[PDB]
Amino acid sequence: FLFHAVQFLIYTIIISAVGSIINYVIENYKLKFITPGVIDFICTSLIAVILTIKLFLLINQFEKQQIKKGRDITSARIMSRIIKITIIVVLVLLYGEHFGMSLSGLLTFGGIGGLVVGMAGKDILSNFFSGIMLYFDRPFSIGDWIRSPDRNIEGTVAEIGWRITKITTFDNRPLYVPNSLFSSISVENPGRMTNRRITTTIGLRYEDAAKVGVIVEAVREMLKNHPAIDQRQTLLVYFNQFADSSLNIMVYCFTKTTVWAEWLAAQQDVYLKIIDIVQSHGADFAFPSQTLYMD
Amino acid sequence: FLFHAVQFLIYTIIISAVGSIINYVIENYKLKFITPGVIDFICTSLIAVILTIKLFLLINQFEKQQIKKGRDITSARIMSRIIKITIIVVLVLLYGEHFGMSLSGLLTFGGIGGLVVGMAGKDILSNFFSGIMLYFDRPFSIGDWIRSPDRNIEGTVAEIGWRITKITTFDNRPLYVPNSLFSSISVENPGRMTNRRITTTIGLRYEDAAKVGVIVEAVREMLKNHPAIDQRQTLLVYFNQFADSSLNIMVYCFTKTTVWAEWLAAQQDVYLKIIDIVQSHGADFAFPSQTLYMD
Amino acid sequence: FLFHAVQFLIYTIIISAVGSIINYVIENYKLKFITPGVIDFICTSLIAVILTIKLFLLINQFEKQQIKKGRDITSARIMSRIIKITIIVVLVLLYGEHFGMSLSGLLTFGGIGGLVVGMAGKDILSNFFSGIMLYFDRPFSIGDWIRSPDRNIEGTVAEIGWRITKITTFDNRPLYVPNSLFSSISVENPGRMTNRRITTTIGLRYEDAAKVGVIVEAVREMLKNHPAIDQRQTLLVYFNQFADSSLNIMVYCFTKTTVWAEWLAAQQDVYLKIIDIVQSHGADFAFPSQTLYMD
Amino acid sequence: FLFHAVQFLIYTIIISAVGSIINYVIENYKLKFITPGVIDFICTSLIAVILTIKLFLLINQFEKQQIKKGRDITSARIMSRIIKITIIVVLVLLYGEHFGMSLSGLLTFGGIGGLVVGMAGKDILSNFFSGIMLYFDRPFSIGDWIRSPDRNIEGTVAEIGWRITKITTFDNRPLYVPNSLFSSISVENPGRMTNRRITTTIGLRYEDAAKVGVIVEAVREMLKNHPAIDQRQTLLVYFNQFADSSLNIMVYCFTKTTVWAEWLAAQQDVYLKIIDIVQSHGADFAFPSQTLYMD
Amino acid sequence: FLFHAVQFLIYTIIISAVGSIINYVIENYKLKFITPGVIDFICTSLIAVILTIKLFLLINQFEKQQIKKGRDITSARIMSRIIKITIIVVLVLLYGEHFGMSLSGLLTFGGIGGLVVGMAGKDILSNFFSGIMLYFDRPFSIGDWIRSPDRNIEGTVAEIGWRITKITTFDNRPLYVPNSLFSSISVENPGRMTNRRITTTIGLRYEDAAKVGVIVEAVREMLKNHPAIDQRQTLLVYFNQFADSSLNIMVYCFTKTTVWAEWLAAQQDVYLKIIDIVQSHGADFAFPSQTLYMD
Amino acid sequence: FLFHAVQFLIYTIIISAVGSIINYVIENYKLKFITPGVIDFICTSLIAVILTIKLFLLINQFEKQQIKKGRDITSARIMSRIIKITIIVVLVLLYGEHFGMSLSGLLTFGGIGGLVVGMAGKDILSNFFSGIMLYFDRPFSIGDWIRSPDRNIEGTVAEIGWRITKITTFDNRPLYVPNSLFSSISVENPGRMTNRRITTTIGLRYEDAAKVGVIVEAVREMLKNHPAIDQRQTLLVYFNQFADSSLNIMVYCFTKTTVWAEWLAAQQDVYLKIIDIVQSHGADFAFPSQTLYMD
Structure with missing residues (x-):
């Protein structure tokens, strides 16, 4: 790693200095058939070979701590093959100037290769x-x-990671959500709610119309005196629907608490009080109804 | 920040001036083995090293005020790693001219890297x-x-931000809507409404046809005299549908007010008056009906 | 393979050295009509021909072990045709400098060819x-x-591959899922669950309201004493719904075990106890109900 | 084909050699108004004309074996027109250096032409x-x-081709599936199944609860003694649902065989035994039920 | 067309030869203020003007046979305007070298123009x-x-064209299907079927269970003796479903013929025989059934 | 327009000729501090200014006939602003060579500007x-x-335009369909139909089976003798379905006429004849049926 990189850099710097000194000497004294470009290419190739050997050393080491935790030899060997081919392809791309072919054909090849890799790995x-x-x-x-x-x-939410988020469902099962979804959907946070809502419908018989009015008042009065109902929020009790077999009265209110069990207990108490109020005034709830014409 | 940037700029300007003076001297007096390009590259590398050190100082400082508000050391360290690799990649891209490799291969590499970063970060x-x-x-x-x-x-709507908009639902829960949605969907604004609408259907029995006409008139007259109904808006009461078990009369009007409770109270009053009118003329509402042929 | 590659590299290195020596001699002694570019092009063409022959040897060998495992001669011959045309196209691209046409037209052709190959093979x-x-x-x-x-x-999950994942369904059938799906959908893992959930609804008759309260308590008490129910998890028994023909009581709890058969046995025991409790208090379950008005 | 290609290559090589000899002579002896570039352009144009004639010969021949199998003259003539225009466009692109216009405008034109051809032919x-x-x-x-x-x-599956796959449906009709679909959908293979599954539900009357327990045991015992049922697979018989008009018992098992007819015969035998067991204990299956309240 | 093209080519060749001779003379004798580039540009402009005039002649002629078949003068004039602007834009692109502006700005303009034309015309x-x-x-x-x-x-299928395919529906109406659809959907070909399929379900009363077995055998025997049923295909008759109000028996077979009328006649004969068999054994078909509990 | 363009071209040609003459004179006689590039740039700038003034004249004129038909001053002024900024941007792009900045940075800017304009205006x-x-x-x-x-x-279809197609619906309302839809959907043309189709189903009681056969024959015979039925088309009358409460007989034929009213009249006549035939043989149509088991 850093030690090997430093050693390789020192070796490369020394080789470059030696090549520069040799070129200067060939300038001073008779260079003969020299081609200083060729000497520099040889020096770079030596540096290239050293870099390749160093990289392959890390490839082998990586394969080692891949296998020691499992990852049976087939998969680890395949992965090492993939990333060593990637490294050699990168090396071929980078130095096509020293001895490589047409720079422009290499432009086309590297460009379309990187571009297909661009479309392919968009999701990750x-x-x-x-x-x-x-x-x-x-x-x-x-x-x-x-x-x-x-x-x-x-x-x-249980954990937040770099790729996926782990969420504990309400049946005690883990769920793994890709992070990109949180960039395009609306996220609602009931965990930061302020009140729980009680909503219901009272369906009365069509023969209870003369009572509907007073019944509504009674229910409203009860909701104004219940100690578990928040009086600073919305509180609506009105007759607002002609159903098929009943007249519908809406009930819409909020509780002071947000705990699940307390909210359910308050809801049950309200429902029982509503039943008592409705039955006290002589009305009744309505089943689905029909009119039958017999032959 | 500005102080460090100014100091670095001053140092760079001074180094460049010194290098230019040295090149001028090498022009005037015997330059020997000079390679002024090499001296300029060394000067730039010194400037590059100074810039890298300055950038890493800010990286460390940023890591510090990231940790002091939480952000446990693992996540903060990882983030610092990401942005320092980004900085060094940018530095490698920018100055491949001074000592870097083939400008054209670097073109291909930087281009496809930026292009994949282009597809990936489109949503943000x-x-x-x-x-x-x-x-x-x-x-x-x-x-x-x-x-x-x-x-x-x-x-x-509760808050408008740079990335998401915070909206308070009607059960007192926060909802976070990505901003891009507001660029492709139709947004309706009931908060800027002018009137509330009352719409309903009266279903009469098939034996009430001889009454339908007069009943309609009665209802219309009532809607023309109700003090809560806007007389400058649409007001329609007509018989317009043969239902399966009933004859349907539409009711379509508007209220003067837009408050929720007042609108509901007016709707309830209108419904009770409609029931009284229908029952006064001898008609009645119709349940679902059927004809049964027994064996 | 490596042997043939080494032989070809040695031959190429020797030919290049011979060409360089010939160019040096033509520099030293009278070169006559030489065109050293032409001699180098001929040398490269010889290297190109050797490389093409070596590649075709591997093409033929590959065709051989393709056929020996089956892959009737038509398909294998077609595949060999495809990859040999691919190889020759790559060779034409790479060396359009030595004798090829306009480098820039070849740029356009190679670029758009690679770019269409880019869109086409995105899924694989x-x-x-x-x-x-x-x-x-x-x-x-x-x-x-x-x-x-x-x-x-x-x-x-049965196997994880490079392209698809093999999953055994619950009717003993293999299913092959493309890997890319695991990058864009939410994956739930019931195999790592901690508890199994028991949820049900008790529908009582509308004439059982006076009993509802006590019944709920009874059921709750039973769930607090069942040896198969986890007491550290959620345990809710409340009356929370006005159904069309019944009053609904929710039951919501968890079992200590996660085994399929034991969970089902505990669920059956709980259901039988619930039936006994409901029938003991004088209530009864409700069928769908209706009110009939005869002519 | 190969013969014509070899003849054209030989002719081109000879023309190029003659042009090179002429250029060398013009170098040696008085060249006068020569413009060797013009002589080389004329030589290339001759080669271009020969190549065009050779290509058109193949175009005509292709049209011939297109017509001799049918493909009425209109369609074949149109197709020949398309591919000859394609050939001439390719020729115009390739050699815009010798006599063509601005290389860079030709770059733009060829590039956007190939790029639109890129989007258009992505599906094939x-x-x-x-x-x-x-x-x-x-x-x-x-x-x-x-x-x-x-x-x-x-x-x-009947046949696998280069573009589409031919599948025989179960009503003896061919179906042609594009190959790309197999790269993005999950493919299930019932042809490689190991067992067939028997799943059913027994719905008992609400008055049969006192029997439910023993009935379940009986059914389970029968499934443990049936010679056609695999005893090493899942075998579940439990009461697990309060239906609207019945109590539901699940039956879940596997057969040893995978043949269609044998599996159906075993299923029928199991169903008849289940009916006998249910009726033997005094219970009965439940029709949809209702409670009627008459006026 | 070919005549005008040949005349224009001859004129251009002659003008180019004259310009070359003039340049050679200006080389030989005193050229004075010559600027041979300017003379060549004038010669090209003359060729450009001739080509433009020739193209406009074809534009006018095309407009003529467009109008003579209808295509009222407004539409034809508009279309001629479009393609003449296209021609002049192409001419401006091609020769921006002779007198045009910056080659690179023209690169950008032509490139993005062709690229937008690329996205726009993808469907055609x-x-x-x-x-x-x-x-x-x-x-x-x-x-x-x-x-x-x-x-x-x-x-x-009625006709196959270059853009759309014409199909005759079964209510004698033409339907025009774009060709690209045949590259992404599965196409089934009932016109190449081999057999027609007869599938049906026999629903017996729940009190007919003791008969079910023998009934199945009877039906199977009949299907084995019917002269219109293919005995080499699938033939299945089994009891395989507990329906809500009936016991279901599947019938699954194939006919020897593929003609519509003969298949329908065979199906009717089979259905009548099935009715006779079912009624002969004392069983009967089942209507939807219900159990009613009166108050 | 053409007059102003001709005047501007004449002025530009004259200015260019004057500049060329001045450059020739500066070549002949002492040019002093000349910088002929600067003189040419000044000449081009004069031409650029003249072109800009001419373009702005057309911009103003266009604004004038935009306002005279309405298009209140705000909208017209805004539109003139948009297209004048577009014109000046185009001018800045075109001549960045004469005095503009780096040609390559201008390449990048113009390219990405045109490219975003490319994605944006794809639909139009x-x-x-x-x-x-x-x-x-x-x-x-x-x-x-x-x-x-x-x-x-x-x-x-009412009108066909360049952008949208105007279609008259069957409730006498205009509908505007974008043209691009006709490139990707299947278009059916009932206006070019050849026959109208009569299809219906006769549902008989389950006790009418003994009659079904003869009834079918009767209906078929009637359809073979009706003067409004096309005898050269498909004509099918068969019993082909076991419905829930009935036995279904299909009727499938075609009429000779395609007029709406005549087709409806023929359909009504056929239906009445079918009713007469069915009732003549002692059968009857079937209502939905049920079996009721009372407690």
Whole structure:
């Protein structure tokens, strides 16, 4: 690593200095058939060979700590093959000036190779960049319950990584969401809610119309006196729908608490009180109804 | 920052002046083995080293105020690694002329690298640009209730940022909408409405046809005398549908007010008056009906 | 292979040395009509011919071990034709400097050829790159049961390859999933679950309201004493819905075990106990209900 | 073909040698108004004319064996027109150096022409490349029954081609699937299945609860003694659902055989045994049920 | 056309020869203020003017046979305007060397113009290329009945063109399908079917179980003796489904013929025989059934 | 326009001739501090200023006939601003050689500007190109009734334009269809139909099976003797479906006429005859049926 790199740099600097001194001597004294370009190319090739050997040393070392944690020899050998071919291709690209062919044909080849690699690896790059963005600006935090109206990502955030985010679903299963999704969908954060909402519909029989009015008032009064209902939020109780078999009354309010169990307990208490109020005034709930004409 | 930049610029200007003076002297007096290109390259390398050291100083400082607010050492160290590799890659690109390799191979490499970075980071850039556009021209304002027929973004706008917009839903939950969505979907603004609309259907029995006409007139007359109904807007009451089990009469009007509770109260009053009118004329509402042929 | 490559390299090095010596001699002694560029072009053409012959030897050998495992002669011959035309096209591109035509027209031709090959082969490249990514970072492992809310990939992972992943479905059928899908969809891993979830709904008759309260308590008490229920997880039993023909009570709990058969046995035991509790208090489950008005 | 190509190459080599000899003579003896560039351009034009004539000969011959198999004269003539215009366009591109116009304007024209041809013919190229990939790595084989959860490609594979794959559907109709689809969808291979699956649901009346337990045991015992059921696979019989009008018992097992007729026969035998077991214990299957409240 | 082109070429060749002779004379004798580049530019401009006049002659002629078949003067005049502006733009691009401006700015302008024309006209080019592909390799033929599971293209093929394919629907209406669709969808060819398929379901009452077995045998025996049923294909008759109100028996076979009327006649005969067999054994078909619990 | 262009060209030609004469004089006689490049740049700048003034004159004139037809001053002024900035940007691009900056930086700037304009204006260009294609090859004509199975474009074609096509719907409303849609969807042309189709289903009671056969024959005979039915087309009457509550008989035929009213009259006559035939044989049509099991 740094030691080998420093050694290679020192060797290269020394070889370059020696070549420059040799060129200066060939300038001073009879150079004969010299071609200083050829001497410089040989010097570069020596540097190129040293760099290639150093790189292959790291390739072998990398293969070693790849195998020692598993990664059976087939897969590790294949991966080493891939990245050594990548290294040699990069080396061929970089120095086509010293001894390589037409610079312009190499331009075309390297350009279209990099360009196809450009389209191919777009998704991984987008995931990495969205991970960086989430590092700098994220709408949630670890432990927050989140959901989206576009995709199914519901659950509590467990970990945030460079490529994927780990979320614990509500059936105790891990879910791995690619980071790029957080750059194009709307993310809702119920974990930062302020109140829980109670919404329901009371369906009365069509023969209870004369009672509807007073019933509404009764329900509203109860909601104004319940100790678990937030009085500074919206509180609506009105008759607003002609259903097929019933007259519908909306109920719309909020609870002071955000805890799941307390909200459910308050909802159950409100529902039981509503049943008592409706049955006290002589009305009743309506089943689906029909009119039958027999032959 | 500005102080370090000024110091580096002064040092660079002085080194360049010294190199120019040395080149002029080598022109005047015997230059010997000079290679003024080499002296200039050494001078640039010194400037390059100074710039690299200055940049790394800022990298370290940035890492420091990243850690002091949290951002555990692993993540901060990784981020510093990323941006220092980015800086060194930029430096390698910029000065491949002084000592770098083939300018044209470096062209290919830098070009395809920037081009893949181009496809990868399109979403973040689009969000930033749409944020700028919303800064200059936005259809809503903070506190406005908005919705869209294409996506689910309903709620009152809370904050407008550079990347995302924060909207408060109607169950008191925050929602984070990417800015780019506001460049391709239709945004409706109910917060700037002028009237609320009352629409309903009266379904009468098929044996009430002889009454339908007069009933319609009655309803229309009531809507023309209600103090909560805007008389300068549309007001339609007509029989316009043969339903499966009923004859349907449309009711279509507007209220003067836009407040939620007042609109609901007016709607309830209108519905109760409609029930009274229908039952006063001897007609009745129709349940779903069927004809049964028994064996 | 390596032997033939070494022989060709040695031959090329020797030919180049001979050509350089000949050019030096033509410099020293009367060169006559020489055109050293032409001699070098002839030398390169000889090297080009040798390289082409060597490549065609490998093409033929490859065709041989393609046929010996099957791959009837038509298909193998066609494939050899394709890759030999590819090789000759590459050779024509590389050395258009020595005797080829306008370097710039060849630039255009090679560039647009590589660019169309770029769009065409994007999917295979993306699959290969996602295979590499799965090699380095994968959310699952061999033998894990996985599923996705976006696509149908449910089953237990059997093999992970360079292009596709083999998954065993639950009807004992192999399924081959392209690797690129794992870069854009959310992958859920039920094989790493911690608990199994029991969720159900108890629908009581509308005449059982006076009992609902006590019934809920009874059920909750039973769930607090069942030896197969995890007491450190969520445990909710509340009345929370006015259904069309019934009052709905939710039941929400977790089991200690994750085995399929044990979870099903515990679920059956809980259901039977629930039936006994409901029938013991005088209530009953509700069928779909209706009200009929006869003529 | 090869003979004409060899003749043209020999003629071109001879013309080039003659032109070089003429240039050498013009160098030696008084060249007068020579412009050796013009002589070389004339020589190339002669070579260009010979190449064009040779190409047109092949164009005509190709038209001939196109017509002799049909392909009425209109279509064949049109196709010959297309590929001869393509050939002349290629010739104009290649040698704009000898007498053509600005090399750079020709760069622009050839580049954008090839680039539009690049977008236009992407689908055919992708089909060809996916055909090559299927040649090297395919998940199925000829005669295998395959299907996909993404598209409708169900049937037994009949032929694999360079562009499309021919599949025989189960109503004895050919289906032609483009090869590129096999690079982006999940392919399931029921032809390589190991067992067939038997899954069903037993719906009992709500008054049969006291029997449910014993009934389940009976069914399970039968499945443990059936000679056609694989005992090493999954075998589940549990009561796991409160349906609207019934209590549901799941049955989940596998058969030893994979043949269609034998699997169906075993399924029928199991179903008849299940009916006998259910009716023997005094229970019965449940029709959809309802509760009617008459006026 | 060819005559005018030959005349223009002869004139251009003569002008070029005259200019070359004039340049040679100016070389031999005192050229004075000559600027041979200017004389050559004037000569080219004369050639350019001649070419422009010749092109405009064809533009006018084309307008003439456009109008003589209709194409009212407005549309024809507009089209002539478009293609003459295209011709002059091409001429401006081609010779910006002789007197045009910066070659590199013209590079940028021509390049981005051609590139936008590249994205814009992709669909027409794709249709043309798919037409060529269909010419070389098509899955159907004129007169074949085809359909697709992806799009609605059902009908018998009538004509195959360069851009669209004309198909006669089964209500005697023409349908024009773009050719590019045949490069990305699966095409099924019922016109090349081998057998027609008979599939049906027999739903028996739940009280007919004791008969089900024998009934199945009877039906199978009949299908084995029907002279219109192919005995070498699949023939399956089994009880395989517990329906809501019935027990379902599958029937699955093939006919020897592929003619529409004969297949329908055989199907009707089979259905009538099935009815007779079912009613002969004492069973009966099942209507939808329900259980009613009255108050 | 042409007059101003001719005047400007004459002025430019004269200025260029004067500059050339001045350069020749400076060559002949003592030029002193001349810098002929500077004199030529001044001459070009004068030409540039004249061209800019001429262009601005047309800009103003265009603004004038824009306002005189309406187009209130704000919009017209804005549009003039846009196209004058476009003109000046084009002028800056074209002549960066005479006095502009680095040609290569201007290359980058002009290239990316044109390239973004390339992506942005793709839709308008595609509409224009599809309009040209429809001019040359269109599947319909003015007055034809067309429809598509992919989009809703049903109606009779009224006008064909360069960007959009105007179609009259069947409720007498104009519809404007972008031209590009006609390049990617299947267009059906009912206006060029040859026959109208009569298709229906006769549902008989399950107790009418003994009659089904003869009934079918009767219906077929009637269809063979109806004077409004085309006897050379398809004519099918068969029993082909076991429905839930009925036995289904298909009727499939064609009428000789294509007029709407005559086709409807023939259909009504056929339906009445079918009713008479069915009721004459003792059968009857079937209502939806059910079997009820009372407690």
